[PDB]
Design a binder for these strands. Sequence first.
RNA 1: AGAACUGGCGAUGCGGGAUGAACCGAACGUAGAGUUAAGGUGCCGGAAUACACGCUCAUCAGACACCACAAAAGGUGUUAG
RNA 2: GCCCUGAAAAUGGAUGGCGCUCAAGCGUGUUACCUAUACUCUACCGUCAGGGUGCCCUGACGAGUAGGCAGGCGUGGAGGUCGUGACGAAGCCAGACGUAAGGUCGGGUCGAACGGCCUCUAGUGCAGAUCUUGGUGGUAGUAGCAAAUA
RNA 3: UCCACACAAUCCAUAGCAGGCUAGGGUGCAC
Lengths: 130, 199, 62, 100, 170, 146, 176
Amino acid sequence: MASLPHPKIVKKHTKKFKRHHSDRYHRVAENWRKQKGIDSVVRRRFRGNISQPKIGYGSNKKTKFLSPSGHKTFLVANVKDLETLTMHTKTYAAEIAHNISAKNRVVILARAKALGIKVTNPKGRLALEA
Amino acid sequence: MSVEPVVVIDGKGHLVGRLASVVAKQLLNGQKIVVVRAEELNISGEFFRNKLKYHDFLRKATAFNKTRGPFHFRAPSRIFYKALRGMVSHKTARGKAALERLKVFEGIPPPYDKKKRVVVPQALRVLRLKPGRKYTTLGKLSTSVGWKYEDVVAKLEAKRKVSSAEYYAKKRAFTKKVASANATAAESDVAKQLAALGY
Amino acid sequence: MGIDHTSKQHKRSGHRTAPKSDNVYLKLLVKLYTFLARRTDAPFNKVVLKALFLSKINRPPV
Amino acid sequence: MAESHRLYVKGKHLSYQRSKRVNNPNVSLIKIEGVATPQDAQFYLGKRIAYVYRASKEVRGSKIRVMWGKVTRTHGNSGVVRATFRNNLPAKTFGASVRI
Amino acid sequence: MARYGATSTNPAKSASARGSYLRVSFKNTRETAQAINGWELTKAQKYLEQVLDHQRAIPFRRFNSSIGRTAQGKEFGVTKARWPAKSVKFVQGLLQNAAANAEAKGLDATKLYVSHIQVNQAPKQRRRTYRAHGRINKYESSPSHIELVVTEKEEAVAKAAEKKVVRLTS
Amino acid sequence: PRKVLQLLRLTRINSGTFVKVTKATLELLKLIEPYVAYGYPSYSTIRQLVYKRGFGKINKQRVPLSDNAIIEANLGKYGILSIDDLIHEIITVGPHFKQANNFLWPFKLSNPSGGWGVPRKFKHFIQGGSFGNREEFINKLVKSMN
Amino acid sequence: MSAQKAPKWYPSEDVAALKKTRKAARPQKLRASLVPGTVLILLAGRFRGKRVVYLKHLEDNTLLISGPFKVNGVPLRRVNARYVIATSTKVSVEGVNVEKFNVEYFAKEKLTKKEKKEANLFPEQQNKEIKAERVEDQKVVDKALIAEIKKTPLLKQYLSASFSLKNGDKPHMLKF
RNA sequence: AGAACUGGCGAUGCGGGAUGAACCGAACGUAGAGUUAAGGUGCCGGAAUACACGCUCAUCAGACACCACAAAAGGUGUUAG
RNA sequence: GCCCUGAAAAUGGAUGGCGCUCAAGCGUGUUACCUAUACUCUACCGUCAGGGUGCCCUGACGAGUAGGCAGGCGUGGAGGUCGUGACGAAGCCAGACGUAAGGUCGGGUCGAACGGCCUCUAGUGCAGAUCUUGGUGGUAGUAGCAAAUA
RNA sequence: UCCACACAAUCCAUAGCAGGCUAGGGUGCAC
């Protein structure tokens, strides 16, 4: 339904709270870890420093765990997992697993189209074979 | 001049620090400004105290050891150029470009027949006048510093001489071309003028 | 600013529905009590609920 | 006496269009609320419109970047005006209050 | 060509050579590959024979450090130059190897120029030679790989394949 | 001095509380003093003060002094809660108008517009600032707090 | 429902209310600036003449004008000026509709239509002036100073305008 | 150096102050719009080359606090009282 | 008051700088502006008030090292449950989010294995410790390859 | 070899808006 995924993009901080003094040393991992010591400017938690992770950055409970398309994705192991998904249709998108083989995707793709749950399953299908 | 592409400014009897404030701001506006008549600008106060300040700056310009700067600028165009660098943020690239946009020329540079213009009450006459601890022209400061000056006033004298001739014949021909109103005229039309604006 | 306000927030609440329920029966029974308390008058049923939620320190042998 | 000089002064940004083929440069549309008098626009044009880039609020990039426009030409002639921007403005700041 | 790096070209069109694990200075050869890129086989051969003789310098655009200077710049004026004879000798070998592949394919004496040359330091061999005061420092050697493809294609293709902007609006 | 602020129920800056007429308050107010601008706001400015800044009582959260909420709601043991009646009754400072002035609890004022509400923090009304008692100026000040 | 977390399910069409307050612009805004509304005319230039309906402000000045042309056609503006002064037709727009589409009779109807307002205009132009009138048309902005005169008056003129705006559209797909 | 009474720093961001742990304003989830504090409005540098007046002409001097110096003596027919 | 006189210091001039002097000084009043994360407001995340039906809503408070507590993420393996696989794990670019721990898929590589859930356990998460070991860049085409002159 | 120059990537009719044809001094030109 709602235009609320426009807030999810708008809100952010997709500042991207990375490690930092990351870029200088390769080793420094891209993933965040808290700045323990005083002397860090970041720990003082000003702007321009990179903002820290907290809960308060968190988006609206309704928007969370959704694609930018606004459909909820549920990862779909097989033909069976589709059966719950066809009930959703409009509500849910199905993202078809990395584990999945080509031949299995075919059955799954073909059945999905009849279900009316096109999102990312046709994209994933094109990719594997065509 | 007060537009977007002119920009030519009259230095005669203008205040150095004041000319530089507006000049910097217009270069920050993005104009390319030609400051003309550099020797004729005046900076107020007695010469002796003014020369004492510059003298220390010369004394500074005696060192470092090294070569390659610092500098003290002898001449009226040069003094004025130094003044802009201080006026504008010298740290930044924007500031730097604005500085590249100045040219200061002494006397007149190669003919700008188009008039150089006074800025909104920039001139030292009114801006002295209670008064005048003395007042010092840039040409007076620089005779004591040394000579890019000596050639510049020499040219000023020749430029002013040549132009002063031109202006007399120009004005003669203009009042002549002009006597339009020495009234003619009335012709219903003048009533139209008085109305036309009027309403 | 602050204070009384900060102190109240600084506290806590209050009960708490008991940690773990090994008994399934105890998990629904307590929930049944808050249920009865709220639709009608009964103060006791609301009181019993808290006590069942606390561990060895609230629950009384009689 | 004057001319303009004076600060009043509110306006709107209508929208800033950062546009080429690579041919065209950048346009900015401004609509000042009532202001310039028809006369005040016309004898003049070149009135420089300076908006401060401040914190509004929460953390906006609160910088020592004071922004200056100029009116290129009117388009609107009694109201709306064309402007262009030259500098760097803060981030997608169409909307924002115009002002000295 | 070989088990390779970046060929990006055509088998009918190109000739291949590569040198495997030669012991020569990695910097000196790099210079030489840089300098004698786009040129023929005959021009390059003379250019290298000249190098050994001290007729032609090889430019050292990169790689510095008390390298002799402009005895003559030859190609351009640049301070740094040597005329590394060993390193030149292996490339003479490499060009002769390619030139023989080219000849065998039946590509013409007239054929074209050197598209692609690289130089990688392959492994660095280990070795060591002892030092004073009961301490050890190591002297090692660099095996190098150099890749050559010479291509049918340079004059012709540069015109034919004419080849990159375009449009506009469906 | 902070603990007496907490006593008046000035929890933050741009907080407000009404106080009554007596020497005892004043004397307690004296410890508070360099916290405060104070004075009598007139009959009208107080009307303008309640409408924007007023809030709801306990047994409910904050719910404002807005139109519906006062007429139907607000507890009121002593007398009539309704908007005009309540405001009259506090200003007259008669019986249990001290219980009326057990407001819900602080008025949370806007910062002054134009800073006409801020003459110097440094100064007293006698220094030429904001500080201290001033009837006239408090009504001007509250208008700005809108 | 039930159990078990929790997706949807859809809705709407609600509100609500206003009404005295519906209205307040709806004549009006005209009141501040003067004038009628659209359709607006070339008095000037040329003497005898002409009609257009003001589809757009891109902003005021920069204004969009239209009529018909599916095939070969007839022209069209975005212009910052050239020629136009108002008439006496008013809609409940100011001046928003648009593209440059029309078509069925549009040019011609608008041409017959003009005659009347223009024929009403030229005596009032003789009564004031003509040569002078160009300079007014040239502006475009506009508006306050003098919104007058009569013309006589509307019903058909509204009909073309209402249609033009509706006409201005198209849907139906196409490749050219 | 060593106590008392208190706030801050430590563990407190952000705005002001050239920079600058504890000076002023200010106690900070996010994001925006508005308006303000402290403090500032010739240029750098928002924003006044503001308005009424008076002294000063040394470049005094652009300074709450501050590694901001300047005294006894103070002349003095400098100005003023 | 002002001011000079008292008034001398070491690599180069400044009141932050340019440096104006009926001021851009300093003091007396005064008008208008500018300006924070403040304050107000809009939207919304936690806590606590609480309400109401695994879920929805009202309003207040809400930086944080040492540090306490509580919820969650990820790891190898076990069992059971849900399955997945001859193009799986794994890899690198990217693509989607979750503040976030992580998450999901795609390119195009790869040629056999892998998730989820519940419950559990533990050789269970690193930038660092003149940390261990291996590999690698700059240092460099640099020092040395020079005293019987053969 | 390179100098100078085309092309494109960087006071009147009045259509129907607009123009711009043709009946009857101000300033751009290789000076």
